């Protein structure tokens, strides 16, 4: 059991494939070139070619970068998608199309005063009878959004053809008269700029009775990360969550027999980004000096975990885990109702008892009370 706790990755940060936006004149620009914009839609089209989740290294389910998944249901093997819209067009006159190149006598105009258009409706993403055989999954990283956008004069784009232009054409064809991404009106114009306006997005994870392990994505854009929250519905299984040093709001709906494990190794350690991935360093001094425990809320450094459901259960313990050495694991046994914790050190008996002094120093460096400690030898 604590063995399963101790049994609980070079995955990239969010945006390595979809792009990480930039703040330009006080608004977020995801992409600012026609070909870059088209490439974003090409990336999105992967959800159709590969499904909403990819399987990396035959061990972990990874959603498409920037795909808005609003619900994951492990009971019904299903997904719900959130909002991924783009502003519609109105007006224009004399529309024709020649060689799949739209032409206008007078060009249409983009408006935020009429209903926006669903990009995902034009993809037709499979959301049912999914394979949730892998018990490790990276959580989705994408809040709902409406893409504001702009056209500009862009010549030489008439021969561009790929899965991105196909998807953009699919949007045009699905909402006739309301979307044109490349068109001639005395000059050649095209979409040049993608400007997401993100929306608060709660992602509901409906768990089954099984062992489910979750990796929280590393989202380096504050304005994206702050629109996201995860809400887990416990079903009495064994659940682990690897928290990111870039925190995301998380609520846990506790069921009677849930075993919850939170891997805090990123939260207690120096973090930097190298080659699009997390680089872990040494432990942070006093990072756990003010753990805040309440029946409905746990505060661990920059992490805030809210709790609902069976929150008045006096008998439940949850566990925080991290690595002190390459051979010794620290488990923080937390009772939310008692507002209390104790410590468990786990490792090989010979090694652990040898390095006991060193290990208790690390605990004290982390800011933890070292007064209640149990020892589990392997």
């Amino acid at each position: 059991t604590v063995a399963s706790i101790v049994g609980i990755f070079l995955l990239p940060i969010a945006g390595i494939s979809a792009g990480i936006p930039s703040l330009v004149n006080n608004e977020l620009i995801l992409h600012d070139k026609a070909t870059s914009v088209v490439n974003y839609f090409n990336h999105l089209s992967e959800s159709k070619k590969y499904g909403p989740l990819k399987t990396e290294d035959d061990k972990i389910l990874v959603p498409i970068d920037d795909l808005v998944i609003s619900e994951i249901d492990f009971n019904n093997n299903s997904i719900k998608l959130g909002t991924c819209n783009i502003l519609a067009m109105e007006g224009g006159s004399g529309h024709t199309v020649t060689g799949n190149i739209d032409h206008f006598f007078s060009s249409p105009s983009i408006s935020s005063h009429i209903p926006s258009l669903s990009i995902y409706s034009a993809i037709g993403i499979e959301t049912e009878n999914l394979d949730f055989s892998k018990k490790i999954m990276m959580l989705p990283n994408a809040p709902s959004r409406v893409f504001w956008w702009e056209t500009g004069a862009v010549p030489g784009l008439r021969s561009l053809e790929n899965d991105g232009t196909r998807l953009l054409d699919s949007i045009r064809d699905l909402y006739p008269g309301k979307f044109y991404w490349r068109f001639y009106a005395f000059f050649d114009y095209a979409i040049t700029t993608l400007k997401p306006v993100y929306e608060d997005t709660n992602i509901k994870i409906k768990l089954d009775k099984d062992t489910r392990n979750f990796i929280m994505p590393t989202i380096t854009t504050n304005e994206i990360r702050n629109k996201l929250s995860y809400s887990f519905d416990g079903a009495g299984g064994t659940y682990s969550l690897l928290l990111s040093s870039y925190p995301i709001s998380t609520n846990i709906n506790l069921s009677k027999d849930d075993l919850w494990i939170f891997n805090i190794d990123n939260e207690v350690r120096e973090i930097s980004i190298e080659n699009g991935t997390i680089k872990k360093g040494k432990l942070i001094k006093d990072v756990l000096s003010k753990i805040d425990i309440n029946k409905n809320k746990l505060i661990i450094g920059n992490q805030t975990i809210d709790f609902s459901g069976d929150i008045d259960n006096k008998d439940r313990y949850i566990f925080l885990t991290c690595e002190l050495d390459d051979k010794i694991s620290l488990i923080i046994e937390i009772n939310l109702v008692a507002k209390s914790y104790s410590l468990l050190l786990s490792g090989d008996k010979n090694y652990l008892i040898s390095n006991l002094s060193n290990t208790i120093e690390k605990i004290n460096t982390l800011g933890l009370d070292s007064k209640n400690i149990a020892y589990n030898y392997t």
Epitope: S245, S272, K282, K285, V287, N302, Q303, T304
Partner: nanobody, 121 residues
């Protein structure tokens, strides 16, 4: 006993650059990671960046390039280089000890009074 005091703010014209600094005393500076935060009225505190004891950094990528955190351990000083300032950057900028990113962690941080940065037209 811990002291943190920021300097370097002021009225700046749009497009200008500014280097903030924070002097520290009362603890072993090099043993801590250090954070820059900014706070404008009507918003929560905004985490800018944290610098590790090895000089590596963790940062918000919307501040990417324009804001750069650095440290000089011998001078017990944290720096924030700011580039191409804009009116939306107007806030009180302050230093916090440790890695403080969430609102509660920032509001409970060991921090300096801040240095005001005002960019306007």
């Amino acid at each position: 006993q811990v002291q943190l005091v920021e300097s370097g703010g002021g009225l700046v014209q749009p497009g200008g650059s500014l280097r903030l600094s924070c002097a520290a005393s009362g603890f072993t500076f090099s043993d801590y990671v250090m954070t820059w935060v900014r706070q404008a009225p009507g918003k929560g505190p905004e985490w800018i960046a944290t610098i590790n004891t090895d000089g590596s950094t963790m940062r918000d990528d919307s501040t990417k390039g324009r804001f750069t955190i650095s440290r000089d351990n011998a001078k017990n000083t944290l720096y924030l280089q700011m580039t191409s300032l804009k009116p939306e950057d107007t806030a009180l900028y302050y230093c916090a000890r440790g890695r403080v990113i969430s609102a509660s962690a920032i509001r409970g941080a060991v921090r300096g009074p801040g240095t005001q940065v005002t960019v306007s037209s």
